[PDB]
Amino acid sequence: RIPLVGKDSIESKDIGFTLIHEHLRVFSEAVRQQWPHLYNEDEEFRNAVNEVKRAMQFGVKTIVDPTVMGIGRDIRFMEKVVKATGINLVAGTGIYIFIDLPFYFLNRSIDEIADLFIHDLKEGIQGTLNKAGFVKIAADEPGITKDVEKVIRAAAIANKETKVPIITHSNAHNNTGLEQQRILTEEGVDPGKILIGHLGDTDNIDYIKKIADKGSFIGLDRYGLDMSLPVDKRNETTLRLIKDGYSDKIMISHDYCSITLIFEDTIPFLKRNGVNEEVIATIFKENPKKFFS
Amino acid sequence: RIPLVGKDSIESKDIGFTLIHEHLRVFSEAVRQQWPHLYNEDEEFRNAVNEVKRAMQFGVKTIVDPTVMGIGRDIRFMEKVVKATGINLVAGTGIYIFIDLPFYFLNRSIDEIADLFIHDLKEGIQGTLNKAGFVKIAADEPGITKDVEKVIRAAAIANKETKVPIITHSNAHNNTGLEQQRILTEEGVDPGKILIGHLGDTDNIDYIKKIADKGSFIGLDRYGLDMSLPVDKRNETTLRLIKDGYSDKIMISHDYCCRWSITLIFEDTIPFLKRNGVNEEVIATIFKENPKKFFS
Ligand SMILES: [Co+2]
Ligand SMILES: [Fe+2]
Ligand SMILES: [Fe+2]
């Protein structure tokens, strides 16, 4: 079912407690490659190994890292951190852009772009046998631009052909994620194979529900890296969302570059307001489980 | 004087017959990093070796390759091909973009950029001892945008700090080339340390000269890419310019390997000029002497 980095495919049912949106490392491939002297491979690798193994202590069995083209996916560093920790790591494919595709994509087709994603998820990633387990796409303040729309559409095709889910990045303040659901569902993707990202950044609880009402998971997924909304206002929308029955559509993560702030703040908090272990299990085991099923 | 790839430095007076703008290889860093199955480095290598050596037989001694960030500069590929051919290859540093910078440069400073250029000139390129002899900037249809502007200034700074010249990519139809000059020159870069590129892509010979008159080299540098102006309209704008005595300001090149190749000018443009009243001194002005002073 779910390919992992380093280890061999697991069954959807054994994903376990999951962090659905976390970055081991992020960069611009062009910058890293032209100017290696800006980066410390050993520091980076130390920091990610410590963060991860802390999370494994707290009960996390699986991290899904949606680092793709444009924010510096490296499957090799990834399998390094797997082998140094024993974590279940799901790598994805896709393209992260907010306006234009790189020049290579001028006069390329939607289908040609999807063949990239299919390659990654059937043959493998950057020449290895580690396979992609989902597709990532993005839009932010610029909105649904032409090239952003191509990428969205190629995700649609990759999902049809392979049935791997799709994770999005979106701007909670400008209707991007609604548009992303609209276009994917229009093209025939199961709404429930979609995670609409970063909705945790707004107070506007109606907009969030609007999306969850159309059958997709809603991403409350930048806890702690809280330049969007204080961790106190997140932990509240989250609670409110749980009280009105949306647990079956809620996913929680950090989007990091700590990875355990939800054990220190959010999960403690939710318990205090009468959220039982069964709803936290729904969010971190069952929702991941079905998303990948 | 001029740092080279796979070889000791050489004097400004020793470049020989130069092609001032030719790319061994060009690709988007993001794409190749993510999807290397799309590229075959073995074919890229044979082609680069072959084309380079064909260029050596028409008596090309030095090639300048303005592949920098955004179009897939790799000095490991360059040095590898330098040893298969024995060319004097001059690598560079700078940024190639037409609108926005990578997310990394968000909130970051003109001097922090300028430092990444100074790094590749003074310390080395991609942590190797091969050093950069010039700085490449670019601008095109989207105009002089905020981030394009920043990259120009960072180039200014690197020219003041190590006095390497600045090659530019510009659009010949919209006055970007003259702004790159203006701004660079405002910042107090010596006009004669600026080659402004791709002016051979236009008829408007009035616009060409203006840039030559303000002291900067003009790049008639896309020979064989017909999609722009055909070879016969190019050779002509070129001829006129020479007959008007713009020789000391003219640089000629193809802008890329491979009837388009790294030697199209030898089989066509040079013979054409020679049967139209252009002597062996005026071409030597263009391919020996103009580079000479550019890198000096
Ligand atoms: Co150019
Ligand atoms: Fe993210
Ligand atoms: Fe070029």
Author numbering:
A (entry chain A): 2 to 258, 279 to 314
B (entry chain C): 2 to 259, 277 to 314
Give verbatim excerpts from the published study on this entry.
Phosphotriesterase-like Lactonases (PLLs) are appealing candidates, being natural lactonases endowed with promiscuous phosphotriesterase activity. PTEs and PLLs belong to the amidohydrolase superfamily, and share the same (β/α)8 barrel topology. SsoPox exhibits high acyl-homoserine lactones and oxo-lactones hydrolysis abilities, and promiscuous, low phosphotriesterase activity. SsoPox is a very appealing candidate for the bioremediation of phosphotriesters because of its unique thermal stability, and its ability to resist aging, solvent and protease treatments.
Of them, the most active variants, αsA1 (C258L-I261F-W263A), αsA6 (F46L-C258A-W263M-I280T), αsB5 (V27A-I76T-Y97W-Y99F-L130P-L226V), αsC6 (L72I-Y99F-I122L-L228M-F229S-W263L), and αsD6 (V27A-Y97W-L228M-W263M) were subject to kinetic and structural characterization. Although the active sites of the improved variant structures superpose well onto the wt-structure, all selected mutants display altered loop 8 conformations. Changes are subtle for some of the variants (e.g. αsA1), but are large for others (e.g. αsC6). However, the active site cavities are larger for the mutants: most selected mutations replace residues with smaller ones: W263 is mutated into M/L/I, V27 into A, I76 into T, L130 into P, Y99 into F. Only two selected substitutions relate to bulkier side chains: Y97W and L228M. Interestingly, variants αsA6 and αsC6 exhibit enhanced lactonase activity against γ- and δ-lactones, while αsA1, αsB5 and αsD6 show reduced lactonase catalytic efficiencies.
